[PDB]
Design a protein around this ligand. Structure first.
Ligand SMILES: O=C(O)CCCCCCCC(=O)O
Ligand SMILES: O=C(O)CCCCCCCC(=O)O
Lengths: 434, 434
């Protein structure tokens, strides 16, 4: 319900963008991923409507670089591209898909702690907005590679702000124990940027920072912004101007439908206001965010038919043709996902929903109360648009699921399922094993 | 070093089956999975040898049903198939692979808590040794399906013995709160078997049981065998004879070279000795085991070239082209894997190894002591032959890696890598989005 603005219940049946979920499952088979085109438009517009304030009080641009790793299906990236959205790519493959999705290079940022010469060349030739440099080793490579191409590479800098360990314990730890960014306090971030300014084939264009994911509190974001901006003034004091300020992504999603969490609006006010408090010290730069889950998560639903009902002395198990290989979130993090029966019964019942993989962790939900589950029913799991198909695999020799896009134009198969032949399409038997 | 019987360090260089690891990396590229054919033969032979005692003392067969879910690369199954190994499949795709690998049907067992009608038809048509029935609901389906097909389905029953909570807490809680098997204590197992004996299209072949994975203690296997055999005795007093007894897999492998673990010999002595104690109450049946990890794990090595060396104020990172999407174990279970520099340097240093994915969990190991790491070196992470490629994915839009098999005949490519074209090979853009 909360966050799922395009779904409803017409006459005891679940609907996605007006389409009958049970019928979709019957038409395209199961397991089936269902992405809502409208929901994506809604999630994107909210980010635009809530940040339009930035191109009024600063006269600068606000760019939304969608984090491809959340879902890089061609049809989806294509759709986001058409909406004028940007792209946050983190590998040669995402850059490849981004460019194929017709996403303007001026709206493309490249992240990653291990960028290969191959990926760098791709970024330079494509003339992406910026290379969110992660280390000095990366800068030296980019610069040396641009020299080779005879071109100039745009470089931002992923920094780890001097966050206060007391106020935000986790944010501080995450920025200091991980592999990303250039530490500010130690003077490495400064060392890097200054090192770049003296190179002839790189063009410093900004700074970047990403503090986490699924954060349902503006506090960390306010703190991040402040510490990042504090570094910008420190740069100005050295005679270094920043064109762009990328604060990454990580805004939580309404997985739990009982409690209300911060919206794009709340996040906008927090950042915008914090930013403005520096309207004097430094020129207000372009603002960039790299939302992933907060753009596609609530648009995806996974449908799975129940093939068996197993009753045990302590639990009532509902077995569905959907498994952890199709959607890894539950089994990997024990994370919560709302689950319901696409058919409304005049009776409730507490059960556990599991997949068919021979892995104990292959469970979608426990002790969930749903309308009487019956063999043949189609259950639906919410919020699988982000980190669902993008992390899907063939564990237990199972092909990845089909994907359909529901739009006002109709329902379209945006991803075909894999057959048994696909499972072995990359395998080769040596001669002595034939 | 422990368990890795086909690798060595010759001239300050790491070798797999006599093949220069660095050269393999140069030739086939990185990231690269390297499977040792001889190691797999050794692991398999260790089981056959340790259990040869069974047929010599009962005249019955001892069958090894390799668990495909640990690794079902066509070449690997093809290899085990030629060794006379059996197959423990849990999906239509695994049965499909098993049958294409020329594994005899009388050496194939099918496990799974959610076997679909489609898969059951496949198992029946193939006349597999047995369906390891996971629930009464599955039993009815199998029988009904065999009926419509006008054939008989061989079935065994996966039971969950009433393991003592105090003794082995983890093992106990699993056989009670998980979705697998038929509860013994509550009488469900007995009920299912008695029920099967009435059906006209099923053939009761035996009992099955699987207690866990990566078990480095012989104690749990003894308890399993005893409680399984006690149940068999109960069936005997009910006039029900048991042809096969499948005790599943679970034997752990030496990820840690520091600790000594049980061998196949310790397992056989534990199982066979316990089994023979029932020779006076019941006729000794065929013995089946479903080794997965203990057959291929130590045969796999993942090679990753270092592209950058990042030095933070606290940790010295080494970024390689091998990522968690290639081998999900570290990032997913925070499990330990031995890692070394294929090149022996005259001095060592402590470093942390990370992949290129933008996910903080994408770290292979922290604070490891390796020979001086230098850009361009090739690192090797041990014991990735099981639950490695089988769990690989394309997270961050990265295709799964290449795999080579090293044998006495030479080194051959057994899995081709995925290109950027492969990543979208299943994606389809709808008309309004072209
Ligand atoms: O801050 C980072 O880079 C690491 C976390 C990223 C989110 C990935 C998966 C999420 C899920 O299943 O909820
Ligand atoms: O009990 C089961 O059905 C399955 C266990 C598989 C875990 C895989 C790899 C990680 C590890 O080594 O613990």
């Amino acid at each position: 319900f909360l966050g799922n603005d395009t779904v409803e219940i017409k006459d005891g049946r679940f609907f996605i963008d007006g389409y009958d979920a049970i019928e979709l499952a019957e038409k395209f088979g199961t397991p089936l991923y269902v992405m809502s085109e409208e929901q994506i438009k809604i999630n994107y517009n909210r980010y635009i409507e809530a940040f339009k304030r930035w191109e009024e009080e600063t006269g600068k641009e606000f760019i939304v670089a969608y984090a491809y790793k959340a879902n890089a299906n061609l049809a989806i990236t294509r759709l986001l591209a058409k909406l004028g959205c940007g792209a946050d790519v983190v590998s040669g493959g995402e850059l490849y898909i981004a460019k194929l999705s017709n996403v303007p290079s001026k709206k493309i940022v490249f992240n990653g702690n291990c960028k290969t010469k191959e990926e760098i060349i791709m970024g330079i030739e494509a003339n992406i907005r910026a290379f969110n440099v992660d280390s000095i080793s990366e800068l030296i490579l980019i610069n040396e590679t641009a020299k080779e191409l005879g071109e100039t590479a745009n470089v931002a800098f992923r920094i780890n702000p001097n966050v206060n360990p007391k106020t935000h314990p986790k944010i501080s730890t995450g920025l200091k124990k991980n592999k990303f960014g250039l530490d500010v306090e130690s003077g490495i971030a400064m060392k890097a940027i200054k090192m770049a300014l003296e190179m002839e084939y790189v063009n410093v264009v900004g700074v970047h920072c990403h503090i986490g994911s699924q954060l349902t509190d503006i506090s960390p974001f306010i703190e991040e912004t402040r510490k990042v901006m504090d570094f910008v003034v420190e740069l100005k004091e050295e005679g270094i101007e920043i064109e762009d300020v990328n604060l990454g992504g990580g805004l939580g999603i309404p997985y739990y439908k009982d409690k209300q969490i911060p919206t794009q609006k709340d996040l906008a006010d927090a950042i915008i206001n914090t930013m403005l408090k520096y309207k004097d010290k430094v020129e207000m730069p372009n603002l960039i965010l790299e939302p992933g889950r907060s753009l596609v998560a609530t648009a995806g639903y996974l449908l799975g038919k129940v093939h068996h009902i197993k009753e045990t002395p302590v639990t009532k198990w509902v077995m569905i043709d959907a498994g952890m290989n199709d959607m890894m979130r539950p089994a990997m993090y024990e994370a919560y996902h709302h689950i319901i029966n696409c058919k409304v019964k005049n009776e409730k019942e507490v059960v556990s929903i599991a997949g068919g993989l021979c892995e104990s962790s292959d469970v979608f939900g426990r002790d969930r109360e749903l309308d009487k589950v019956e063999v043949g029913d189609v259950l639906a799991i919410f919020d699988v648009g982000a980190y669902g198909i993008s992390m899907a695999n063939n564990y237990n020799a199972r092909g990845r699921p089909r994907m359909v896009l529901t739009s006002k134009k109709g329902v379209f198969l945006i991803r075909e399922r894999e057959t048994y032949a696909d499972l072995i399409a990359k395998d080769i038997v040596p001669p002595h094993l034939l």
